[PDB]
Design a protein around this nucleic acid. Sequence first.
RNA 1: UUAAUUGGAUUCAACGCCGGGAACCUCACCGGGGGCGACGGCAGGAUGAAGGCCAGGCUGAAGGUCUUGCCGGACGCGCCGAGAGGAGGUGCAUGGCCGCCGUCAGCUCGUACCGUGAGGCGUCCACUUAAGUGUGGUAACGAGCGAGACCCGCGCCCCCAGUUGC
RNA 2: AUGCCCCGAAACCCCCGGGCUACACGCGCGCUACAAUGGGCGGGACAAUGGGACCCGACCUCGAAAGGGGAAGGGAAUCCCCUAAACCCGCCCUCAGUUCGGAUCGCGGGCUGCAACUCGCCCGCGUGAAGCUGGAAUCCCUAGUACCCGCGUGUCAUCAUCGCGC
Lengths: 50, 56, 186, 102
Amino acid sequence: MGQKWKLYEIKDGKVIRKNKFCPRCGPGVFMADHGDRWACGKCGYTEWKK
Amino acid sequence: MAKADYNKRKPRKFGKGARRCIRCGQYGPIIRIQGLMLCRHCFREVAPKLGFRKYE
Amino acid sequence: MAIERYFIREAVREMLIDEFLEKELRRAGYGGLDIKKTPLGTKVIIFAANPGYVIGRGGRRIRELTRILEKQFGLENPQIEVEEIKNPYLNAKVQAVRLAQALERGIHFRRAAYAALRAIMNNGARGVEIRLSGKLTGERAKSIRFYQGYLAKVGNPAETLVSKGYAQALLKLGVIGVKVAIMPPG
Amino acid sequence: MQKARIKIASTNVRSLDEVANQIKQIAERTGVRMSGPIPLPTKRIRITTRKSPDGEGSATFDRWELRVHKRLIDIEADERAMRQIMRIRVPEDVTIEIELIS
RNA sequence: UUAAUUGGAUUCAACGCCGGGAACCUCACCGGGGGCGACGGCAGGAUGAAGGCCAGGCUGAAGGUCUUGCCGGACGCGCCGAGAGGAGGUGCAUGGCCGCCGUCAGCUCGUACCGUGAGGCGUCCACUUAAGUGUGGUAACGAGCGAGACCCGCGCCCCCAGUUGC
RNA sequence: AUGCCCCGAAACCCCCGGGCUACACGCGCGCUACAAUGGGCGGGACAAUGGGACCCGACCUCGAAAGGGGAAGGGAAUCCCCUAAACCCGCCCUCAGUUCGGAUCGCGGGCUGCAACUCGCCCGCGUGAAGCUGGAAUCCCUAGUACCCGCGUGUCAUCAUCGCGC
């Protein structure tokens, strides 16, 4: 099965946005922010930072 | 990260290398393709089923 | 395509099911397959010795038999029947199999020619032969021939007018190749 | 009436006029005017194979031959007559093709 | 000779033979890049994947590989029993199939007889034929496989059938 | 198919590229061929076995061509490849290593496929080699056979001076 991966930040009391959310998958899936480039792990996309 | 992918992508679509036989799984004999799809070794035993006759 | 080539494209399908059936019905004992092909549907009457392993336990084999023919066959409406073999000795494909069982046991070559050459002839036959290629349980290749009546004769006539069975009998030392040729009366 | 050409190709010597003079029986259920069986050629297929897998030395290769022998019958009759003929065509042995023209 | 020129065959019975398809494929052989092991068992489970992935840096292609940031839902690597697969080894271990000697006139049996026996006779002898083929003689009388006639085609005539024919 | 034994990121598995036709040679099996018994040019008389729906391709147009464009019919005694080739008559040539012979190669182009330097075929223009009748020695065949001429088919994208057949 597993071991070992988390990259989700933990907030207290409030809500934060770690990253951008895919607009092609709605919220749930968080884009990797390199500088200007967006990755998506759900299906695999090549995306640019809209 | 993760283990690679690989898949079958050989251009078998032309030549002797495209062919195969359903009755011995190979096409290394001298194959026949007109009519039936079988080889010469599956036409030593097959031929009088199909009404091919031994006599001349 | 042609109407000359419509005996090469139905006849092949008959070849394909003869080879697969003989092997998977040694649980019951195999003997033949009478395949009657109509555009309506292919009706295969399996001859087998035991009816109770060719119908299954509850249609277990019956589901296997429906699904098999359809891959091979252009007829997508197969029906199945099991008829019994009612003279095992009349047919050469139940004496190839009967002789194979006795060899796989270690029952020698002459000690099994009691029941596959002194029983087949009692049943009726113009001629019968048993041929046993192998090494004869040795280490070098040898064959032995047993012959009764007319079944080899001058010309193709009376030797390509036979009923014919081949079986494999497996040894842990080798293979032995089992030929029994009955030529029924005629 | 409607003209049918029944073209009947067979692998057997004696199944060819035995189903071209006794397919007149099958056919007739109403009145019919029928043409006696007209022999067309044997179209011959050869296929030659080596029986040798190794091929070596001197060898003898099997030339096979299947001869498919053709009769053509014309009949002028109703829909029902034509139907009898295409309703049954046995195991084949006998290939039956039908051509339909007025 | 080349990185390799893939292997067999190798007198008849190997050499336009498997190859009656030889640019990759084919292909076995060689070179470089990556990578799977079933089904049970074994520690592991949600402490997130076995799968996925921008962007340059690298691969003949694949986030494959790295820096780097990041998802969807959930069982299989590793091996140990033990299979699938191997165009993996051995055809002086084989089946199946084939070549040649040989489309040869040979090769066997039963009873009898002869001989301690192996065996002989018969299957020899004379004549005759492609043939252990046939005839007569004979201590022998008969039978089987092979070969002949049998099976298929080829020639001449008749009859049937007619869109071949005109 | 199969006894036995071995192999398990591997003698497995996937992929790209290569080689089997490399070459001073020798041997096996074929072909082309050495010219006036001739070739060219032109005309006229003649096929048979077979195969045929992303296939044979009528016929019509552009190209010397390879090939392309439009399009009829045909799953077959009924349409297509398809008119065979040898044959013969007249003229031209005037008998050379060439107007023989096609080796090798340049430039132009077609076709298949990811791709034809190594290993494709075909055309046009140039190139035009070796070869000028074969020593020792050796092989084939007995009648519709051999001597000799073309045609079709297979495998099949492609290599045919091959194989099977007419």
